[PDB]
Every structure is written in structure tokens, then in C-alpha cells.
mmCIF file of all heavy atoms in Angstrom:
data_model
loop_
_atom_site.group_PDB
_atom_site.id
_atom_site.type_symbol
_atom_site.label_atom_id
_atom_site.label_comp_id
_atom_site.label_asym_id
_atom_site.label_seq_id
_atom_site.Cartn_x
_atom_site.Cartn_y
_atom_site.Cartn_z
ATOM 1 N N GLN A 1 0.817 -1.188 0.019
ATOM 2 C CA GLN A 1 -0.017 0.005 0.019
ATOM 3 C C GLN A 1 0.859 1.254 0.017
ATOM 4 O O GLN A 1 1.837 1.337 0.730
ATOM 5 C CB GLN A 1 -0.925 -0.005 1.228
ATOM 6 C CG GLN A 1 -2.007 -1.084 1.179
ATOM 7 C CD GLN A 1 -1.507 -2.460 1.639
ATOM 8 O OE1 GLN A 1 -0.436 -2.509 2.287
ATOM 9 N NE2 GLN A 1 -2.206 -3.485 1.309
ATOM 10 N N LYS A 2 0.555 2.188 -0.902
ATOM 11 C CA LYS A 2 1.135 3.524 -0.896
ATOM 12 C C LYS A 2 0.011 4.542 -0.795
ATOM 13 O O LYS A 2 -1.000 4.400 -1.469
ATOM 14 C CB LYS A 2 2.045 3.763 -2.110
ATOM 15 C CG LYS A 2 1.303 3.754 -3.453
ATOM 16 C CD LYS A 2 2.292 3.451 -4.582
ATOM 17 C CE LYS A 2 2.786 2.016 -4.579
ATOM 18 N NZ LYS A 2 1.660 1.018 -4.538
ATOM 19 N N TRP A 3 0.223 5.556 0.030
ATOM 20 C CA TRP A 3 -0.848 6.530 0.335
ATOM 21 C C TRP A 3 -0.712 7.744 -0.546
ATOM 22 O O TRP A 3 0.352 8.369 -0.626
ATOM 23 C CB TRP A 3 -0.826 6.888 1.811
ATOM 24 C CG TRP A 3 -1.395 5.842 2.722
ATOM 25 C CD1 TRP A 3 -2.570 5.890 3.380
ATOM 26 C CD2 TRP A 3 -0.799 4.536 2.989
ATOM 27 N NE1 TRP A 3 -2.775 4.765 4.081
ATOM 28 C CE2 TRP A 3 -1.707 3.890 3.878
ATOM 29 C CE3 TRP A 3 0.389 3.905 2.626
ATOM 30 C CZ2 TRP A 3 -1.452 2.630 4.399
ATOM 31 C CZ3 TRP A 3 0.635 2.601 3.140
ATOM 32 C CH2 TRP A 3 -0.307 1.986 3.989
ATOM 33 N N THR A 4 -1.799 8.131 -1.218
ATOM 34 C CA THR A 4 -1.828 9.218 -2.189
ATOM 35 C C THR A 4 -2.834 10.252 -1.724
ATOM 36 O O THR A 4 -3.856 9.957 -1.172
ATOM 37 C CB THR A 4 -2.201 8.684 -3.559
ATOM 38 O OG1 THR A 4 -1.359 7.586 -3.898
ATOM 39 C CG2 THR A 4 -2.051 9.802 -4.623
ATOM 40 N N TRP A 5 -2.521 11.554 -1.983
ATOM 41 C CA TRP A 5 -3.320 12.669 -1.559
ATOM 42 C C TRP A 5 -4.553 12.793 -2.474
ATOM 43 O O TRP A 5 -4.405 12.764 -3.711
ATOM 44 C CB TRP A 5 -2.518 13.941 -1.556
ATOM 45 C CG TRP A 5 -3.269 15.129 -1.056
ATOM 46 C CD1 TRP A 5 -3.503 16.281 -1.721
ATOM 47 C CD2 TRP A 5 -3.818 15.312 0.280
ATOM 48 N NE1 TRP A 5 -4.226 17.178 -0.956
ATOM 49 C CE2 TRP A 5 -4.428 16.601 0.301
ATOM 50 C CE3 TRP A 5 -3.886 14.512 1.379
ATOM 51 C CZ2 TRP A 5 -5.067 17.081 1.428
ATOM 52 C CZ3 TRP A 5 -4.511 14.981 2.516
ATOM 53 C CH2 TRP A 5 -5.102 16.275 2.527
ATOM 54 N N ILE A 6 -5.722 13.019 -1.900
ATOM 55 C CA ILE A 6 -6.955 13.204 -2.663
ATOM 56 C C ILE A 6 -7.771 14.295 -1.942
ATOM 57 O O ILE A 6 -8.299 14.020 -0.868
ATOM 58 C CB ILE A 6 -7.739 11.924 -2.818
ATOM 59 C CG1 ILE A 6 -7.031 10.957 -3.719
ATOM 60 C CG2 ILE A 6 -9.129 12.206 -3.357
ATOM 61 C CD1 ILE A 6 -6.946 11.407 -5.165
ATOM 62 N N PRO A 7 -7.994 15.467 -2.526
ATOM 63 C CA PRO A 7 -8.849 16.472 -1.869
ATOM 64 C C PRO A 7 -10.315 16.084 -1.946
ATOM 65 O O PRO A 7 -10.722 15.320 -2.824
ATOM 66 C CB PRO A 7 -8.579 17.758 -2.660
ATOM 67 C CG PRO A 7 -8.217 17.244 -4.037
ATOM 68 C CD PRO A 7 -7.510 15.916 -3.836
ATOM 69 N N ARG A 8 -11.086 16.567 -0.984
ATOM 70 C CA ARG A 8 -12.511 16.196 -0.944
ATOM 71 C C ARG A 8 -13.251 16.831 -2.097
ATOM 72 O O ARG A 8 -14.045 16.129 -2.793
ATOM 73 C CB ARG A 8 -13.114 16.625 0.403
ATOM 74 C CG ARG A 8 -14.637 16.438 0.435
ATOM 75 C CD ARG A 8 -15.188 16.565 1.843
ATOM 76 N NE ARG A 8 -16.638 16.555 1.905
ATOM 77 C CZ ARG A 8 -17.363 17.597 2.058
ATOM 78 N NH1 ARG A 8 -16.824 18.858 2.171
ATOM 79 N NH2 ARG A 8 -18.677 17.532 2.049
ATOM 80 N N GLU A 9 -13.077 18.096 -2.354
ATOM 81 C CA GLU A 9 -13.717 18.799 -3.450
ATOM 82 C C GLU A 9 -12.787 19.880 -3.984
ATOM 83 O O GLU A 9 -11.904 20.366 -3.284
ATOM 84 C CB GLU A 9 -15.055 19.409 -3.060
ATOM 85 C CG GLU A 9 -14.968 20.728 -2.342
ATOM 86 C CD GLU A 9 -14.741 20.535 -0.832
ATOM 87 O OE1 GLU A 9 -15.040 19.482 -0.306
ATOM 88 O OE2 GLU A 9 -14.259 21.539 -0.220
ATOM 89 N N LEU A 10 -13.038 20.286 -5.240
ATOM 90 C CA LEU A 10 -12.288 21.345 -5.845
ATOM 91 C C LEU A 10 -12.806 22.695 -5.333
ATOM 92 O O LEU A 10 -13.955 22.821 -4.947
ATOM 93 C CB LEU A 10 -12.369 21.297 -7.374
ATOM 94 C CG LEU A 10 -11.504 20.179 -8.010
ATOM 95 C CD1 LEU A 10 -11.598 20.220 -9.488
ATOM 96 C CD2 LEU A 10 -10.074 20.270 -7.533
ATOM 97 N N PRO A 11 -11.923 23.722 -5.253
ATOM 98 C CA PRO A 11 -12.389 25.019 -4.716
ATOM 99 C C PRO A 11 -13.552 25.639 -5.462
ATOM 100 O O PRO A 11 -14.396 26.293 -4.827
ATOM 101 C CB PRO A 11 -11.136 25.885 -4.855
ATOM 102 C CG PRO A 11 -10.317 25.204 -5.896
ATOM 103 C CD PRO A 11 -10.553 23.731 -5.727
ATOM 104 N N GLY A 12 -13.659 25.429 -6.789
ATOM 105 C CA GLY A 12 -14.759 25.976 -7.544
ATOM 106 C C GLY A 12 -16.095 25.281 -7.386
ATOM 107 O O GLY A 12 -16.994 25.522 -8.137
ATOM 108 N N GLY A 13 -16.220 24.451 -6.357
ATOM 109 C CA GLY A 13 -17.412 23.693 -6.131
ATOM 110 C C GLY A 13 -17.489 22.369 -6.875
ATOM 111 O O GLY A 13 -18.453 21.634 -6.710
ATOM 112 N N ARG A 14 -16.512 22.072 -7.680
ATOM 113 C CA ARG A 14 -16.498 20.796 -8.418
ATOM 114 C C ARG A 14 -16.344 19.651 -7.418
ATOM 115 O O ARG A 14 -15.522 19.637 -6.512
ATOM 116 C CB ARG A 14 -15.352 20.726 -9.417
ATOM 117 C CG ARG A 14 -15.133 19.386 -10.062
ATOM 118 C CD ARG A 14 -14.538 19.489 -11.425
ATOM 119 N NE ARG A 14 -14.019 18.231 -11.923
ATOM 120 C CZ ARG A 14 -14.067 17.829 -13.202
ATOM 121 N NH1 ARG A 14 -14.589 18.596 -14.131
ATOM 122 N NH2 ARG A 14 -13.579 16.638 -13.528
ATOM 123 N N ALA A 15 -17.212 18.624 -7.583
ATOM 124 C CA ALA A 15 -17.266 17.479 -6.706
ATOM 125 C C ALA A 15 -16.318 16.417 -7.215
ATOM 126 O O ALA A 15 -16.684 15.541 -7.966
ATOM 127 C CB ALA A 15 -18.716 16.954 -6.604
ATOM 128 N N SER A 16 -15.051 16.492 -6.732
ATOM 129 C CA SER A 16 -14.075 15.502 -7.187
ATOM 130 C C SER A 16 -14.220 14.209 -6.346
ATOM 131 O O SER A 16 -14.476 13.153 -6.926
ATOM 132 C CB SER A 16 -12.673 16.069 -7.045
ATOM 133 O OG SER A 16 -11.687 15.202 -7.601
ATOM 134 N N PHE A 17 -14.003 14.301 -5.031
ATOM 135 C CA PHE A 17 -14.056 13.121 -4.171
ATOM 136 C C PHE A 17 -15.310 13.205 -3.339
ATOM 137 O O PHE A 17 -15.344 13.831 -2.267
ATOM 138 C CB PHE A 17 -12.825 13.032 -3.238
ATOM 139 C CG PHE A 17 -12.646 11.678 -2.626
ATOM 140 C CD1 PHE A 17 -12.239 10.624 -3.419
ATOM 141 C CD2 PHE A 17 -12.872 11.481 -1.293
ATOM 142 C CE1 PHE A 17 -12.048 9.341 -2.825
ATOM 143 C CE2 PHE A 17 -12.700 10.225 -0.718
ATOM 144 C CZ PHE A 17 -12.262 9.172 -1.479
ATOM 145 N N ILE A 18 -16.377 12.564 -3.855
ATOM 146 C CA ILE A 18 -17.673 12.522 -3.186
ATOM 147 C C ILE A 18 -17.591 11.542 -2.031
ATOM 148 O O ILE A 18 -17.576 10.313 -2.238
ATOM 149 C CB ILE A 18 -18.758 12.106 -4.176
ATOM 150 C CG1 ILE A 18 -18.850 13.099 -5.345
ATOM 151 C CG2 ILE A 18 -20.131 11.951 -3.482
ATOM 152 C CD1 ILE A 18 -17.979 12.808 -6.529
ATOM 153 N N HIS A 19 -17.506 12.084 -0.826
ATOM 154 C CA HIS A 19 -17.439 11.282 0.368
ATOM 155 C C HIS A 19 -18.751 11.427 1.159
ATOM 156 O O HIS A 19 -18.868 12.366 1.917
ATOM 157 C CB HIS A 19 -16.253 11.728 1.227
ATOM 158 C CG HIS A 19 -16.127 11.071 2.591
ATOM 159 N ND1 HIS A 19 -15.786 9.717 2.745
ATOM 160 C CD2 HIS A 19 -16.384 11.512 3.844
ATOM 161 C CE1 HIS A 19 -15.814 9.373 4.001
ATOM 162 N NE2 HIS A 19 -16.162 10.449 4.716
ATOM 163 N N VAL A 20 -19.666 10.525 0.963
ATOM 164 C CA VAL A 20 -20.988 10.591 1.547
ATOM 165 C C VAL A 20 -21.068 9.566 2.710
ATOM 166 O O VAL A 20 -21.026 8.369 2.492
ATOM 167 C CB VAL A 20 -22.105 10.340 0.580
ATOM 168 C CG1 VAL A 20 -23.456 10.333 1.302
ATOM 169 C CG2 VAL A 20 -22.118 11.455 -0.484
ATOM 170 N N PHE A 21 -21.179 10.073 3.951
ATOM 171 C CA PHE A 21 -21.316 9.177 5.095
ATOM 172 C C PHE A 21 -22.269 9.866 6.083
ATOM 173 O O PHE A 21 -22.408 11.096 6.081
ATOM 174 C CB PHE A 21 -19.977 8.925 5.752
ATOM 175 C CG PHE A 21 -19.456 9.987 6.631
ATOM 176 C CD1 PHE A 21 -19.489 9.901 8.000
ATOM 177 C CD2 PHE A 21 -18.918 11.144 6.095
ATOM 178 C CE1 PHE A 21 -19.023 10.886 8.828
ATOM 179 C CE2 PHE A 21 -18.429 12.164 6.911
ATOM 180 C CZ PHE A 21 -18.460 12.032 8.278
ATOM 181 N N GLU A 22 -22.910 9.047 6.904
ATOM 182 C CA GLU A 22 -23.787 9.561 7.928
ATOM 183 C C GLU A 22 -23.068 9.668 9.244
ATOM 184 O O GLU A 22 -22.728 8.620 9.843
ATOM 185 C CB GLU A 22 -25.016 8.689 8.090
ATOM 186 C CG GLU A 22 -26.276 9.398 8.644
ATOM 187 C CD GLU A 22 -26.232 9.513 10.141
ATOM 188 O OE1 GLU A 22 -25.522 8.704 10.810
ATOM 189 O OE2 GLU A 22 -26.822 10.480 10.668
ATOM 190 N N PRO A 23 -22.761 10.847 9.771
ATOM 191 C CA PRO A 23 -22.139 10.954 11.112
ATOM 192 C C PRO A 23 -23.171 11.025 12.188
ATOM 193 O O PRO A 23 -24.064 11.865 12.228
ATOM 194 C CB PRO A 23 -21.396 12.281 11.001
ATOM 195 C CG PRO A 23 -22.134 13.124 9.931
ATOM 196 C CD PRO A 23 -23.015 12.160 9.138
ATOM 197 N N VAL A 24 -23.052 10.048 13.124
ATOM 198 C CA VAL A 24 -23.908 10.006 14.269
ATOM 199 C C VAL A 24 -23.696 11.155 15.224
ATOM 200 O O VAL A 24 -24.648 11.593 15.912
ATOM 201 C CB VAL A 24 -23.735 8.673 15.055
ATOM 202 C CG1 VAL A 24 -24.842 8.461 16.075
ATOM 203 C CG2 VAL A 24 -23.742 7.491 14.044
ATOM 204 N N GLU A 25 -22.472 11.691 15.295
ATOM 205 C CA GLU A 25 -22.169 12.834 16.135
ATOM 206 C C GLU A 25 -21.196 13.715 15.418
ATOM 207 O O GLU A 25 -20.721 13.418 14.318
ATOM 208 C CB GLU A 25 -21.595 12.396 17.510
ATOM 209 C CG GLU A 25 -20.191 11.801 17.425
ATOM 210 C CD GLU A 25 -20.235 10.284 17.121
ATOM 211 O OE1 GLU A 25 -21.281 9.820 16.692
ATOM 212 O OE2 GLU A 25 -19.174 9.659 17.328
ATOM 213 N N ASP A 26 -20.864 14.858 16.044
ATOM 214 C CA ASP A 26 -19.909 15.785 15.480
ATOM 215 C C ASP A 26 -18.474 15.208 15.493
ATOM 216 O O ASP A 26 -18.126 14.384 16.353
ATOM 217 C CB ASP A 26 -19.869 17.117 16.282
ATOM 218 C CG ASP A 26 -19.653 16.881 17.753
ATOM 219 O OD1 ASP A 26 -19.831 15.711 18.223
ATOM 220 O OD2 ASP A 26 -19.345 17.854 18.466
ATOM 221 N N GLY A 27 -17.713 15.596 14.466
ATOM 222 C CA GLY A 27 -16.364 15.149 14.375
ATOM 223 C C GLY A 27 -16.155 13.697 13.975
ATOM 224 O O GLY A 27 -15.022 13.271 13.765
ATOM 225 N N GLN A 28 -17.237 12.924 13.821
ATOM 226 C CA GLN A 28 -17.166 11.558 13.427
ATOM 227 C C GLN A 28 -16.748 11.471 11.972
ATOM 228 O O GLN A 28 -17.178 12.325 11.153
ATOM 229 C CB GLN A 28 -18.524 10.867 13.668
ATOM 230 C CG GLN A 28 -18.521 9.413 13.153
ATOM 231 C CD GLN A 28 -19.903 8.808 13.317
ATOM 232 O OE1 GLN A 28 -20.792 9.406 13.898
ATOM 233 N NE2 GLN A 28 -20.063 7.609 12.768
#
């Protein structure tokens, strides 16, 4: 395994890495 950087979204609002999860509490 080698770890590569992936931003969540582009600054212009472009949805690059769509990370959809349900957090039960804050910071989860």
C-alpha cells in the first residue's frame, strides 16, 4: 500500500471526491 493525496472537493465547487457518510455525532 502507498498513500496518495486526494482532496474532498475542488475550490470551484467541483465534486471531485464525493465522500458521503452519515455521522452519528460531530467530528465523526
Side-chain angles (χ1 to χ4, degrees):
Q1 292 81 18
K2 64 202 71 53
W3 284 252
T4 309
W5 183 240
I6 291 293
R8 172 166 172 259
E9 80 276 339
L10 286 183
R14 172 152 165 145
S16 187
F17 197 72
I18 299 90
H19 175 71
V20 174
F21 79 105
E22 205 279 334
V24 192
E25 69 275 16
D26 53 345
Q28 176 185 353

